[PDB]
Design a protein around this ligand. Structure first.
Ligand SMILES: [K+]
Ligand SMILES: [K+]
Ligand SMILES: [K+]
Ligand SMILES: [K+]
Ligand SMILES: [K+]
Ligand SMILES: [K+]
Ligand SMILES: [K+]
Ligand SMILES: [K+]
Ligand SMILES: [K+]
Ligand SMILES: [K+]
Ligand SMILES: [K+]
Ligand SMILES: [K+]
Ligand SMILES: [K+]
Ligand SMILES: [K+]
Ligand SMILES: [K+]
Ligand SMILES: [K+]
Ligand SMILES: [K+]
Ligand SMILES: [K+]
Ligand SMILES: [K+]
Ligand SMILES: [Mg+2]
Ligand SMILES: [Mg+2]
Ligand SMILES: [Mg+2]
Ligand SMILES: [Mg+2]
Ligand SMILES: [Mg+2]
Ligand SMILES: [Mg+2]
Ligand SMILES: [Mg+2]
Ligand SMILES: [Mg+2]
Ligand SMILES: [Mg+2]
Ligand SMILES: [Mg+2]
Ligand SMILES: [Mg+2]
Ligand SMILES: [Mg+2]
Ligand SMILES: [Mg+2]
Ligand SMILES: [Mg+2]
Ligand SMILES: [Mg+2]
Ligand SMILES: [Mg+2]
Ligand SMILES: [Mg+2]
Ligand SMILES: [Mg+2]
Ligand SMILES: [Mg+2]
Ligand SMILES: [Mg+2]
Ligand SMILES: [Mg+2]
Ligand SMILES: [Mg+2]
Ligand SMILES: [Mg+2]
Lengths: 69, 153, 117, 55
RNA sequence: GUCUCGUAGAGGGGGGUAGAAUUCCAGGUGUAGCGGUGAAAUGCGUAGAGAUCUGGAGGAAUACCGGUGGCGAAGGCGGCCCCCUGGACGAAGACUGACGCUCAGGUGCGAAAGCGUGGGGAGCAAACAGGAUUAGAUACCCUGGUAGUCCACGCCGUAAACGAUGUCGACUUGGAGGUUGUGCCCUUGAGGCGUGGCUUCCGGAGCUAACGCGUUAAGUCGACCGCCUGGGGAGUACGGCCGCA
RNA sequence: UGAUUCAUGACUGGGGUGAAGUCGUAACAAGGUAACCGUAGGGGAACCUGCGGUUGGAUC
């Protein structure tokens, strides 16, 4: 994330651009995940759980789009 | 309360001056429902303050209230972990209520002859930024300043 | 004592502290301040407000050099990532560049074990 | 076929920081995404592309 | 089962190399804190730390790509490059002519920890030490830290080594996806119509104590093997074999 | 001079049953540090810690 403040650009706008670029790069999440060691079984379990949750939520949304409350 | 169903209660203005501000002050000073006694004490103290200073009773009372009114206080906030003393802005009605309560407590703590004399001395000290309830406003402001770093909880 | 007018503010924003160091463009430090050293300890030391106070103190410490323009390099995930930059802009410096320099291993060494709290 | 020398084409599949963009974002087929990753790594080694934007 | 052409793949063995980052060493700037926690203290720092810049040494692992993605008998395999090398799949043929399936005993492979000899050692970290917490705290938290984790060769032969589901073959309604081949057609592209391999989720009949399984069966059948027979004692004792332990 | 089998032996190892005395609270809920498997080291005790593995983990 290298944000060069252009001429006549307000500092608040430059700061918001820098924040957006950092969020898009995802450096904070990377640091947080690298803070402590995750055992490979733990990493595999987490990835599988996330995939299962995504699929189940999509199926539930598909089912709920065809019903009335 | 939980249900948020509490309205507001109208308060009659005081006899001599027609000020709900002074009527609330009399209510705070009153004990055991002896409103006439509280009114007599307040009136005697106000006349002593008015003859001590050059302003009217209401103006001197307003000066004392301005000197005693706090702006930011500290309230406890318990989140995941430990409880923090978060500084919060005080609304004007609570500012007035706290100023009056502190003034009355300081006057009761004083050790002069009569309660009217104690109240007059406390009001004059408040107008000159001395004594109790002024030290109390100062302590509250100091605590808020010390905990200013927590003003986002 | 020599004028610079073109400096770099390095922000070291860790979870426990914020360190602000102003150097010239060649990396030679001119002054520094820290949130822990600006009268904050414990839970107060790791807040954005403490970081802002540290940034103000660093600006005061470098006031003699007459710095006008500042690049900014932020490193770390700490809460003092943006308050320091805001305070640096409010102190009068002209914020020319802002860059993230947080180190990321490309794999790297094994991190310490997870905490069981 | 993806060429590691085709820097102009390869630059469409890297971010500003130099990271390889996911195929789920670029709409690339998986078989070609693998070739893109190999080509980008070769170009990085030959210094035709940067590893990181802090160069 | 063999040959011909091609395809994808972290399949295996050997060698080289690249960039990021940590640690350590030296120097420049600079000055009073750093680090840590729930809060602290131990620890580090005026003998100049922490921070920032430059140069060097060294080990280990390969961000992004990356995916209920791929390969492999299982265990497992992830930067890039070269060398040696195993398997799978598809399209047209050509060839052999039941050469097949399963397998007691036997043999081979077999995560992590551990063992032997010789190396290596950045980071991490059993044991250990100190600081905390607590009634205590031989812990959980903090500061350190040795085997070990790494390499070569040999041993060990165990894991919730799991799909808690042996291998091989045939048969029996459907839907939506992933991945990898290949045929045909058109207005030629995120195109349409098929046809193979592997794979994820749902669900029909049927099955099941139920949960659920459901063409990758736990359905309907055949071939062969392994295994069970109330809980505890006990996968223990004794004996044998194997092992340096 | 061996083998095998029965009896017996100071002392010693763990096991079962009873009974509930002392010490803690390991497991069952996210059981208050998810549990469990193999292995290794440590500890009055249940156990704790490292390494890999499983879901037969709650919340998300
Ligand atoms: K090959
Ligand atoms: K390598
Ligand atoms: K046979
Ligand atoms: K060794
Ligand atoms: K080492
Ligand atoms: K350590
Ligand atoms: K080898
Ligand atoms: K073993
Ligand atoms: K499994
Ligand atoms: K297919
Ligand atoms: K096809
Ligand atoms: K053996
Ligand atoms: K030994
Ligand atoms: K005998
Ligand atoms: K005997
Ligand atoms: K436990
Ligand atoms: K549990
Ligand atoms: K264990
Ligand atoms: K003991
Ligand atoms: Mg830590
Ligand atoms: Mg606890
Ligand atoms: Mg060394
Ligand atoms: Mg081959
Ligand atoms: Mg056998
Ligand atoms: Mg090992
Ligand atoms: Mg040993
Ligand atoms: Mg060894
Ligand atoms: Mg060492
Ligand atoms: Mg430790
Ligand atoms: Mg077994
Ligand atoms: Mg396994
Ligand atoms: Mg089994
Ligand atoms: Mg496969
Ligand atoms: Mg089903
Ligand atoms: Mg059954
Ligand atoms: Mg045994
Ligand atoms: Mg247990
Ligand atoms: Mg317990
Ligand atoms: Mg506990
Ligand atoms: Mg527990
Ligand atoms: Mg055993
Ligand atoms: Mg221990």
């Amino acid at each position: 994330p290298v944000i060069k403040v252009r001429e006549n650009e307000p500092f608040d706008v430059a700061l918001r651009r820098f924040k957006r670029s950092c969020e898009k790069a995802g450096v904070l999440a990377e640091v947080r995940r690298r803070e402590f060691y995750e055992k490979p079984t733990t990493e595999r379990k987490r990835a599988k759980a996330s995939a299962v949750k995504r699929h189940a939520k999509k199926l539930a949304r598909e089912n709920a789009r065809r019903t009335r409350l | 309360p939980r249900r948020r169903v509490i309205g507001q209660r109208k308060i009659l203005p005081d006899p001599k001056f027609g000020s709900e501000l002074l009527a609330k002050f009399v209510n705070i000073l009153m004990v055991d429902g002896k409103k006439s006694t509280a009114e007599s004490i307040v009136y005697s103290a106000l006349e002593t303050l008015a003859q001590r200073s050059g302003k009217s009773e209401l103006e001197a009372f307003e000066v004392a209230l301005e000197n005693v009114r706090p702006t930011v206080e500290v309230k406890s906030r318990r989140v995941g972990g430990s409880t923090y003393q978060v500084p919060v802005e005080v609304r004007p009605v609570r500012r007035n209520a706290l100023a009056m309560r502190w003034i009355v407590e300081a006057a009761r703590k004083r050790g002069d002859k009569s309660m009217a004399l104690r109240l007059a001395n406390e009001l004059s000290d408040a107008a000159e930024n001395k004594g109790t309830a002024v030290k109390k406003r100062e302590d509250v402001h100091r605590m808020a300043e010390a905990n200013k770093a927590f003003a986002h909880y | 004592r020599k004028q610079v007018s073109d400096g770099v503010a390095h922000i070291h924003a860790s979870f426990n502290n914020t360190i602000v160091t102003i150097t010239d463009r060649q990396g030679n430090a001119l002054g520094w301040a820290t949130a822990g050293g600006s009268g904050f300890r414990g839970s107060r030391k790791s807040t954005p407000f403490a970081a802002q106070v540290a940034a103000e103190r660093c600006a005061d410490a470098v006031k003699e050099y007459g710095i006008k323009n500042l690049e900014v390099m932020v490193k770390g995930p700490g809460p003092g990532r943006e308050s320091t930059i805001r305070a640096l802009n409010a102190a009068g410096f002209r914020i020319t560049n802002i860059t993230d320099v947080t180190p990321i291993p490309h794999x790297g060494c094994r991190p310490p074990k997870k905490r069981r709290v | 076929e993806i060429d590691y020398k085709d820097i102009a084409t390869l630059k469409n599949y890297i971010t500003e920081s130099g990271k390889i963009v996911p195929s789920r974002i670029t709409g690339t087929r998986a078989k070609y995404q693998r070739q893109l990753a190999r080509a980008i790594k070769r170009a990085r080694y030959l210094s035709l592309l940067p590893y990181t934007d802090r160069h």
